[model samples]
Target: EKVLYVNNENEPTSFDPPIGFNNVSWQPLNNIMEGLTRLGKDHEPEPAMAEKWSVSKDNKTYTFTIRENAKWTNGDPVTAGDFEYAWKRMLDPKKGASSAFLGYFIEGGEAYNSGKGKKDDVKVTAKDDRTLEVTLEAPQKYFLSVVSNPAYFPVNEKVDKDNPKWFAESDTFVGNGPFKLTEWKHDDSITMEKSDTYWDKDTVKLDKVKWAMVSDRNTDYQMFQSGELDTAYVPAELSDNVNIVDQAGLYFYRFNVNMEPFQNENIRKAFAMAVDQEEIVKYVTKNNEKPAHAFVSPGFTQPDGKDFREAGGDLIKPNESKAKQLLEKGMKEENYNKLPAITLTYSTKPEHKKIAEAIQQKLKNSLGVDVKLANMEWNVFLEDQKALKFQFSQSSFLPDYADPISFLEAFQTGNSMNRTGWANKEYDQLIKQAKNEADEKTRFSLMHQAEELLINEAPIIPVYFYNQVHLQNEQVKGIVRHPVGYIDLKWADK
Candidate 1:
C-alpha cells in the first residue's frame, strides 16, 4: 500500500464534525468528508460534488447541479438532498453545533438557528436528486468558501439512521470523499484507503493514509526521525526544521468576563499588557510566529493593500509600569488590598505547558499577581471554557475562510463559541453593518473599525499568529497543507 503516516495530536472528540470545532476535529474529518467544493492548491474553492452552480442576479440565490458520478463509499448516490439535510442539520441549534454560526449566511438560517423562525423557513432545498438550491440573506464574497468547509459536508441519511453513533466508529462511517475509512483504532491510529467510488478517484495518487495520535512533540519528533511518520512538527529545540508555512490562526487567551475582577476593562488590559508576547514568539514559539498585537491574524489584507493587522497597529503593548498602574487602579477601585490567585488553564501539550509557565512568571514580575496553572484533557478544557467556569483559558481561532469576517464574527453576542461571557453592542452592530454593506470599501472600513473596538476591549489577549513548524520526508509529494493549518493528502504521491 502506498501510505503516508502522520502524527495527529489527539483522538478527535467527534468525527461527526461541526460538533468538534478544533483542529483535531477538522484534520481528520476533512479527509473523511468533503463538501460541495474542495479546496484547490491555491486555497480557492473548486467544484466537487456540485460540478456546476449558477447564481441569481441578486447573488442571494444559488443553484447547483450535482455531479452525476458522485457516490458514497457504500455505492449510494450522493444527492443534493444529502447536502440539504446535512446543512440544515448543522444549522439546527438543538445539535449544539460549534460552527452553527457559519450557516447564518444562508437566507433565514440565522432565524432558524437562533430559534426566531421555523425549520421550513430555511431556504436550502433539493429540487431533485441532482439539483440543490441555496438562498443567502445577502451577497457575500466568501460564501462559496464558507460552503467548502467540512461543516457543510453531506451525510448519508440512511447510514446515519441505521446507527445513531455512525460517526464514532469506522464500521458505521460512510463518506463520499476520495478516501474511505478502513480502520479507526481510537487513541492509536486511523487508516483510510482511496475510495473506488470517488468521482475523481483516478486523480487520487495515494492508496492509504495513516495518523498516529501522539500527544508529545518529542514523541512526534522521534517518530519522524525513525521514519515512522511522514511529517511532524519539531520540538521547540528543533527550530531548524524545514517547511516554514504561514497559517491563518490566532493563538490567544480568553478572560472569563462573568468572573470576578476580569469584568473590569482596566484589569483585562492590565493582564493583557503583563504577558511578554515578544518573548513568547521569539523564544517560546522558536518559529517566526508573527506577534499578534491585534486579534485578527495577518492574513486578511485590505482592499487598499493593507493587512487588517497592519492597519490596526499594536493596540496593547507589554509595559511593566503600565501594567502595574492599571492593576493598582483596578484593585483600588474594586476595594481590594489583595486578590485571590488567578487560575490559568491550558492543555497538557509541551508548548501549552511552557507558555503557561512563562505567562505565570511574567505576571508575577510585572504586576505581582500570583497565578496557578491547571492541565486537563482537550474535551474537559473545551467544556470548562464553554461554561465560563475558568478564570483564564487557552483558545485559538483558525479562519473558516480567507475573509476577515471569518476571523472576527466569533465574538458576536450569544454565539455558541463566544465562551468569554462578554458582549459589546457597538462591536456587534459594526460587524452587522459590515455584513450588510454593499460597497466593498465601506464594508471593510466598518470591519476595521469593529476590530479596533474589539482589540481595545481586550476580551482575549492576543498572543501570536501561528506558523507550521513541521518536517516532511523527501519522498512524500503534493500533500496539501492549506493556509488554515490542516493537511490534506488526497493529492500526495510517494
Candidate 2:
C-alpha cells in the first residue's frame, strides 16, 4: 500500500538496461538489474550477484564467483556469459553507444571501442556457468568499484534480441531486480509493481511505485502538500520548510567547445570571469548551494583531509576588468571586433530559466555580450544535447565514484561527457600516467596537475555545488541517500 511519487523530467530512453541509457532511464532500470555488487549504506562496495571475488598478485586479473541462488526474473540461471555478452555489446562501436568508452581502461576495451579490434579481443571470459574471469590491461585501484557501476549490469540476451526497443515500450521489457514495469504513459507517468518472482522479493517491502513527469516545482509542492503525492522535488523556496536532505553532488554549467564563440579560449575565460558565482548562489540558488569554481568537489578523497577546496588555493573570482581584457584579446585574435550572437539553451523549468536569465544578464552587464535564451522541455533538452544541437548549454555532472579520475577523465577524447569537443594531448597524457602510477601520493599529485589545467582552460563554467533536498514522511524508513543521486529502492520502506 505504500507508494512514492517522483517528479521525473523525462521518461527513460529504454527500460532494456542497454542501448544508450542515461540517468533518467537508469533510475527505473536500476530496480530491475541485479548488479554483481551494490554500494552499501556507507558507500562501500558489497557483494550482490558475485558472492566473492579474488585478484591475482599482479592485480591484472580477477575471478568472480556467482551465488548459487541468483536467477533472472524469467527463472533463467544468471551465468558468466551474460556478463561477457553485455560487456561486448556495450563496447561495440557499431552500436553507437555513448558510454562505449567507459571501460576503456579494461584490457581490449579501448581497442574494441575504437573499431581496431573485435569483441574477442576483450579480456573478459566465461570460465564456466558460475565463474567469470576479467583480465585488466593494468592493475587499477578502482577496478572493482568501476565494475560495480550500473553500466556493467548484465542483460538477458534473449530478451534484448527479441525486444530491440524494450526500453521505450512496456511489453518488451523484463527486469531482474525487485520491481517490474507495469505501465509507462509516456510524458504522464510510469508505474511499477513489486516483482513476485524477484530473487530478493522477501526484502522488497513496497508493493508499488508511481513516477509522475512533473516539471513545475510549484505543482509538485502543491501535490505533496495536498497528500496526493508521497514525495516530490523540494523547491528552493520551500527547502527550509521541508525536511531538507543533502544528497551529495555538485551541479554546474558546461559550455560546448565545438560551438562558435566558445571555440575561443579567451571567450570562454571571459564568460567565466564575468559571472558572479557568489551572487548566483545567494540570489539564483537562494543560498541552497555553495558556489563551485573548481571542478572537483570537497570530501571526495580519503581521511577527509585532501579536498579540492583545501588543496587548491583561492577559487576563481569574478573580475570585470579581466573579462574585458579576454574579450578584447579574443576579438583581436579572431580578426573580428563584434562578438557573435550565441544562444544559451536550458531545460524548461522555472529554476533553469532563472539561472539562465541570471547568466544572460551577467554576460551583458559585465562583458557587454548578448546571449539569447532558448528553453525547451527536459526530454528535448537531453536529446538535443546528445545530438550536439545547441551552441551554449547548461549541464550537471555527478561523479560515479569518489575519485578525481571520475571527474577529470570525462574530458577524454572519446568519452560521452566530452561532447564539447575539448581535447588536450598533455591533459590526456597526464591522466593516463596518473592512472598507472602505483604510489597514491604521486598519483594524486599528477591528478592535481590535470585539474589545474582544466580549471585554467575553462571548458565548462562551474555554477555551484548542489545541495539536494529530499522530503520523506515520518513513517518512511530504511531509505538511504547517495551522494551521486543513486538510490536502491529495495531497502526503502514505509
Candidate 3:
C-alpha cells in the first residue's frame, strides 16, 4: 500500500470531534469531518457539506442547503441535525471548549458560550433534514467564512451520544471524509486509511498516511534523508541544503497573566521593547523569515500598499532608551524598588531555544534585568500554558483562514489564544464593530484601530513571521500546499 510519513511534534490530546478541536487537533481531523464549506486550492471558501447557502436581506439569518449525497463512512446520511447538534454542543459552556470563538459570529453564540444562555437558546435551527438556518444577534460580515471552520463540522450524534467519547477511541469514531483513523499510538504516530465510503472516494489517491511524532527538526530531516519519512519540516541549520517553501505566518513570545511581572502590561511592554526582533530573525531563522513587527502577517489581509511592514514600522522597532523610560515609569507607578527576575518559557525545539537565548541576552544587556529560560516538549508547553503555569511562552499561530479577524481575535477576552488574561474593553468593541460592518473600508479601519491597541498594549511580543520549509521527493505528485499547514491526502499520489 502507498503511504506517507509526516513529522509532527505532538499527538492529539483528544479526537472527540466537538470538544477538543483546534489547529493542533485539526492537523488530523481535517481528513475526518466535512464542514458546510472547505477552503479551496485558491485559499477561498468553497462548498463541501453544504451545496449552497443564502443570507437574508438583513444579513441576520443564514440558510444552508446540504448536498443530497453527503454520507458518513458507515453510509449513514449526513443531515442538518448533525451540523446543528455539533455546533450547539460546542457552544454549550459545559463542554469547556477552548475554540468556542469559532461560532461567536453566529446569532446568540457568544451569549451561549459565555454561560448567559442555554444551548437551546442558540439561534441555529434545522428547517428540515437537509436545510440549516442560523439567526445571528447581529449582521456578521464573516459568518460565511466562520462556517468553513472544522470546529463547525458535523459529528455522528448516535455514536457521540452513546459513548460521549466515541470520537476519541479508534473503533467507535466514524468520519464523513476521505480517510478514517486506523491506528493511533499516543506520542508516537498515527495511521489512517482511505475510507471507501467517503463522499469523494474517487479523488482519494493515497491508500494510507502515517504521521510520526518527530519533535527534533534535525531528527526529522535525517529521517527524510534516509527515506524513512516521506515529508518533514526542514531545520534552520539545514535550510541551505533543502528546497525551501515559505508558508506565511507569524511567531510571537506570549506572556502568561497568571505569572507575575508579565501580569503587568507596562512591564510586558518594557520587556518587549528591550529585544531586537530583526536581529533574532536574521540569526535564529537563518534569514528564512521576515521580521514580524506587526501582529498580522503580511499578504494575509493587508492590501498591496498597506502591509503591516509599512504601517507598523515605527511602533514595533526596538528602542532601548524608550524601553528604559517605560520601565522607569512603570517602576515608579508600581512603587517597585528593584528589577524583578523574569522567566521566558519555550518548547525544546532548537530554533525556539535559540530565539529565547537571544532574547535573554538582549534583556540582560539592555535593561540590566535578570532573565531565565525554561524549556519543555511541545505538548508539555501547551499544557503548562493552558493551566496558566508559565511566566511567558512562545506561540506560532497558523491561521485557520486568511482574515485580519483570524489574528486579531486572539486577544479577545477568554479566547484560546488569550493565554494571558489581558482584556481591553475598547479593543473588544473595535473587533466587535469590525465583524458586523459591511463596508470594507470601515471594517479595515476598525481592524487597524485594534492593531494599534495591540501594539501599544503589548500583551504579546511579536517576534518574526513564520515560514515552513518542507522537503518532498520528486517522485511524489499532486501534493498541494495549504496555507493552514494541512496536507490534503485526497490529491496525493506516488
Candidate 4:
C-alpha cells in the first residue's frame, strides 16, 4: 500500500495558515500548502511555488517568478496576486492575527499592522500574474528561511472570495502543494492524497496519508505497537528505540513580572537558579536533551566558528546556596515577614506535568518555599498566558527561522512572543541593533550581550533544549525532522 499512517496527537487549532501557527497545525499544513520557498531535505530554503527569484543590489528588494505550472487543487493557476492578498490579509490591523509579528520584516509591515500606516504602503506587490515583488525594511540574511514558515503561506484569492471559511473544511480547501486534503472528520481523523496539479507532483512518493487524533501518549504508543500508526513519541517507559535529533527550541518557565514575589528580580533569579535542568532531562523527561544555559540553543554557529551556546557559556547554573541567599535578600527588600503563596501553571500534558512537578520539588528542596501547581488545556493555557492571567507559567520557544535573531527578538518590548511581562529598554536596543548590524562579527556580539542581559534579569528560567525522541515503525522512511521548523513528510515513503 502506498500510504503512510501517523498520529497528530490532537486536533489542529485551525488550517487558516497564520491562525493555526503552532506545532499541531503547522505539521500538517506544511504538506498541504506551498510557500514561495520550501525547506528542502537538507533543511535549507529552496524554490517551491516561486520557481526562481532575483534580489536588488541593496538586498532589500526581492522579485519572484512564480512557476507557470503551479496550480491549486481546483485547477486554478497560482498567481502573484494570491501572495500579495494573503500577506496583506495577515498584516491588516482589523484582522488581529496573532502571528502577524512574523511579517514584521516586510517594509512598513509593523506600522500597517499596528494601524499607524495604510495597507498599500506595506511594500508587497503583484507585478503581474506570474511575478511578485517584496521590499524589506532591512537586508535580512534569513529572509528565505523565514518565508518557509507556514505563516507566510498563500490563500487562493478567488476561493476566499467565494467563501471566507475556505480552509475550515477539507472540501473547500484549495492547495498548491504535494498533497490535497481528501477527508477531515473534525477531531477524529484526517486524510490526504497526492495532488495531480502540484507543480512537482511526480516527485511525491506517497499516494495517501492518514492522521489519527489520539492525545494520550500511552494510547498513541499502543496504537503504534498494534501497527495502527506508523510513528509515536517514545513514552518515558519505553525510551530506547526512538530516534533522537536536535531541535532549536527551549523548554522553560515564564514569570509574570507584575505578580508578587516575581515582582522582585532577585526573587525571580532565586527561583530560576534553584532548578536543576540536567537532572530533569536525564531522570524525569528520560529523553536525550541538552540542558539549556542561555536563550539560544546549540547548532547556531557564530562569526568565529563557535556555537552560540558555547560562546555565551552558562548564564545560570544550579546553586542551592546562592538561591537561599537571594530568596532571603529579596524578602527583606520587599519587607515580607511571610512570603506570598506561589503557584506554578502548565498545560495539561504528561511531559509538562512531569517537568512542573520536578521544578516544584526543586524549589521546595532548595529554598524551603511551598509552591502550588495548576493545569489547563493547551488552548486555554495559551489564552490565559497571553492575557497575563497566570502568575508563573510554563513556556517554550521555537525559532521562526534559522537566525539567532528569531530567538532574541521575542523578548523585545510589546512583542507577541514575549508573553512574560518583562521589558528592558537596553535589551530592546541590543536586539534592534543586532537586526540591522551589517557586520557579522558585530551582530553576533550584540546578540550575545542581549542574551546575557535577558538571563541576568531573570524574567524566565532556562531549562533544557528540545530534542525529537520518537519511535518510528520499521517500514517508515525519509521523514525529515527539521531542527528549526516543523516535521517534513513530503519526501516520506514506506
Candidate 5:
C-alpha cells in the first residue's frame, strides 16, 4: 500500500468520538469516523452519511435520508438509530462528552444535557433504518455545521454494548468512513488503511496513512524536510495555505476566574491589556496572525457591509500605563498592597518555552508583576487546565460551525469546556437571545452585544486571530483541508 505519512502535534487524548473534543482526537475522528455532513468547497454543509435532508417550513425540524450503502466495518448495517443514539449519549449528563454543548441547537438538547428534560422530549428519532429526524427549539443558521463536528458522529451500539472500549483498540474499532484503524502506537503514531467497505471507497486514493505523534512543531518541520513526513503544519516556515470558507479560530489565554485576583474584573482586564501581542506574533509565532481583540475572528461577515471583526474594533492593545492603573485598582479591591505572582502555562517544546518566557517577560515589564512560566506534556497539561488548576492557561477555539454562536456559546454556565469557572446570568441570556432571535440582522447584533460583554469581562484573553498556515508536499493532492483547518485525507492522493 502507498502510505501517506503525516504528523500529529501530540498523542490523541482519546479515540472515542464523543469522549474526545480536542484537535488531536478530531483529526483522526474526521478520517476513521464519518459524520452526517461535511463542510464542502464553500464551507457549506454537504451530505456524507446522510444522502440528503429536509428542513421544516419553520426550520425547527430536520429529516435526513440515509443512504443504504453506509455500513460499519463490523459488517453490521448502520441505521438512523445510531445517529440518534450517539447524540443522546453525548446529551446524557453522566456520559461527560465535553463537546456535548455543540448539540444544543437541537430541541430539548440543552435541557436534556443538563438533566432538566426527558430523553423522549429531546426530538431526534430514527423513523426507520433509512431515515433520521431531529426537532430543534428554534431556527439555527449553523445547525448543519454543528452536525459536522465529530462529537455528533455515529457509533455501533451493539459493538459498544459488547465492548465499551471498542473505539480504543484497532481491531475492535468500527466505522463507516473511508478508512479503518489498523494500528495505534500511543504517543508515537496511529496507522490506518483504506476501507474497502466505505460507501465512497472508489474516490479514496491513499492506500494508507501514518500519523506520527510528533509534539514539537519545529521537529515536525525538520521531519517534513527529511521526507519522513508527507505533510505537516507547525510554524511560519511551513507551506502556504488559504481557506475558501474561512474556518473560524482563535488563539488566547484562559483565566481560572474561580482563582484569586483573576476573580476581580479589573485584574482580568489588567492582564488582558498588558500582554505585548506584537512581540509574540512577530518573534514567536512568526505567522501572519492578526492580533485579536474581539473573541470572534475576521472571516465572519455581517448582513450590513462589513466583517464582524472589523466592526468590533480592537479593544485590547499594548498599554502599560492603562494596565498599571487597572492593576492598582484591582489590587486595592482585592485587599492587597501588591498583585500576587501568577503562572502562565503551556504544552511542550523549546518553541513553546520561548513563547511562554516571552509572554512572561512581557507581563513583568508591561504590568510590573512577576509572571512565571510553566510547562507540561499535552494530555496532562489539558487535563490540568480542564480541572481548573491553572492561574492562566494557553488555549485555542475553532468554530464547530461558521457562525459566531459556535465560538461564544462555549462559555455558558455548566458547559464542559468552560473551565474558567466564570458565570454571569446576563452573559448567558445575551447568548440565548442571539440563538432565538428571528430577525436576521438582529440575531447578529445580539451576538455582537454578547461578544462585547464577554470581552469587557475578560474571562478569556484574546491573543490573536489565527490562520491555517502549514507545509504540504507538492505531490499531496485532492486532500480536503478546510479553511477551518482540519486536515482530511478522505479525498487525498499523492
Candidate 6:
C-alpha cells in the first residue's frame, strides 16, 4: 500500500467546516473535502466540484455548474444546495465563526453574518440540483480563489440534517474529496484513506495518509529519522537538511490594545521596535524566512510590476535608543509612575517558545523591561487570543487568497481576526475603498497607504515572514504545498 505518514503538530480545534479555518485544521481538512474550486499545483484556482462557471458582465454575479461525477462518501450526489447550505452555515452569526469575514464579498453576506439582515436576503441560491447562482456585493477579482479555502468547502446537506454532529467523528463524516477520514484517535493521530467514490479518484496515488500529533520539533525529526514518519519539520539544530520554500504568511505578535501598557500608541511602538526580527530568524528560527517589516509578505506584485513589500519598504526596525525614548515619552504622557508587568504568551510548541524567549531577551536588553513568558496549548491559545485575553500574544496569518488586502483587512475595526482592540477610522476607510475600487492602480495605491498607516500605528509587531521548512523522505513524491493555501495530498505517493 502507498501509505504516507506525516505530522499535524497538534489537535485541530474542530472538524466543523467554519470553525476549523486555521492552518492546523485545514491541512488535513483540505484533502478530506472538495470545494467549488481547488488550488492547483501552480497555486491557481481550478474547477473541482464545480465543473464550469460563468460570470456576469459586471463580474458581480457567478453561476456554477456542479460536476455530475461528484459524489459524497455515502453515495449522495454532490449538489448546488450543499454549497448554499455550507456557505450560509459559515455566515451564521450564532455560530460565531471567525472565518465569517471571508464571506463578506457575497451580496448580503455581511449583513446576514452580522445579524443586520435575514438569511433570506443573502444572495446564494440553488436554482436546481446542479446549478448555483451567487451575487457579490462587489466585483471581487479573487472571488474564485477565495472560495477555494476549506471554510468554503461543502458539507453534505442530507448528512448534516440527519446528524447535526456528523463531522465530529471519522465514522460520521461524509466527504467528496480524494480521501475519507478512516480513523481519528483525537490528539494522538488521524488516518485518511483514498476515496474510491471521489470524482477524480484515478489521480489519487496514495492509498492512505497517517498524520501524527507531535508538537515538539525534536520528537518530530526523530520520528522522521526513525522511519516512523515520512515528513518532519526541520528543527534549528538540523536546519541544513531542510527544503525551504517561500510561504505567503506572517508569524507575528499582537498587542491587545485594550490591555495595559499596550493601550498607549507610543508604548506599543516601543515594544514593536525593540524586537530584532533579523536576529530571531537568523539565530533562533534558522529557517531562511525573510524578516517581515510590513504586514504583507513578499510575492504580491502591483500593476507597475513593483513588489508590494519593496514598495512599502521597511515599516519597522530595531533601534534601542529610539525604543527607550518612546517608552519614556509614552509613560510620561500616561502619568505612569511605574510600568505595569508585561507577559509574552505563545502556543505550546518548542519553536514558539524559542521565538518568545528571543523577543523577551531583546525587550529586556533594549528597553530595560523584564517581560514574563507564558505558554498554552494550541487550542487554548487560539481561544484566549481571540478573546483578547493576552496583553501580547503570538499570531500567524496564511492568506485565504492571493491578495494583499487579505492581510490588511484583518485589523479593520471589529474584524473577528483583529483580537487587538486597535481600530482607526482612516485605516478602515482605506480597506473598504480598496476592496470596492475596480481599477488596479487605484486599488494598489489604497492598499499601500493602508499598510503604511497600520505599521505606523503598531497594533502588531512583525517578526518574520513564513517559509516552509520540512524534511521529506526520498520515497515521498507529488505532494503540492501551496503558499496561499493548504497542502494537497491528492497527487501524493511513496
* Highest lDDT scorer: 6
Task: Assess the local accuracy of residue 139 in candidate 1 as a C-alpha lDDT between 0 and 100.
Answer: 83
- Best-to-worst order by TM-score is 6, 1, 4, 5, 2, 3
Model with the higher lDDT, candidate 2 or 5? 5
Model 2 over residues 408-478: C-alpha lDDT tens digits?
Answer: 88776646776677788889999889878888788888877888888788877878876666655656666
| lDDT for each residue of candidate 6 in 13-72, tens digit (9 for 90 to 100) | 888988977988989999999899998878889999999999999989999999987899
Stretches of model 3 off by over 4 angstroms after superposition: 18-22, 138-141, 240-248, 257-259, 301-305, 312-314
Candidate lDDT values, in order? 0.84, 0.76, 0.77, 0.89, 0.81, 0.91
Model 3, position 134: C-alpha lDDT score: 89
- TM-scores of all models? 0.98, 0.94, 0.92, 0.97, 0.95, 0.98
Alpha-carbon shift of residue 111 in model 4 (angstroms): 1.4
Q: Write the per-residue lDDT of candidate 4 for residues 277-362, one digit (tens) a residue.
A: 99988888777788987789988998889988888899999999999999899999999887899999999878889889999998
lDDT of 3 by residue, 1-494 (tens): 78877765667756766544545577788777778887666656677888899989998898999988888877788999999999998887888777677777677788889888777778888999999998888776556666766778898777678788777656777888778888877788888898887777788888998888777778987898899887777666653344555565688888875566666677778888987888887777774677877888766545445764455455577889988888888877777898666788898877788888888888888888887888887766776777777777888776655677778888887678778777889988998888777787777778888988988888888898766567787666666666653545667887
TM-score of 2: 0.94
Which candidate, 1 or 6, would have the higher lDDT against the true structure? 6
**Model 2, poorest ten-residue lDDT window?**
239-248
Q: Sort by lDDT, best first.
A: 6, 4, 1, 5, 3, 2
User: Candidate 6's error at 308, in angstroms?
Assistant: 0.4
Per-residue lDDT of 380-425 in model 1, one digit per residue for the tens?
Answer: 7887778888889888788888877777788888666678887999
Q: Of the pair 3 and 6, which is ahead by lDDT?
A: 6
* Candidate 1 lDDT (Cα, 0 to 1): 0.84
Counting clashing residue pairs in each candidate, in order, gives 0, 4, 2, 0, 4, 0
Candidate 6 residues lying further than 4 Å off, grouped into runs, are 239-241
Models, CA RMSD each:
1.3, 2.2, 2.5, 1.5, 2.0, 1.2
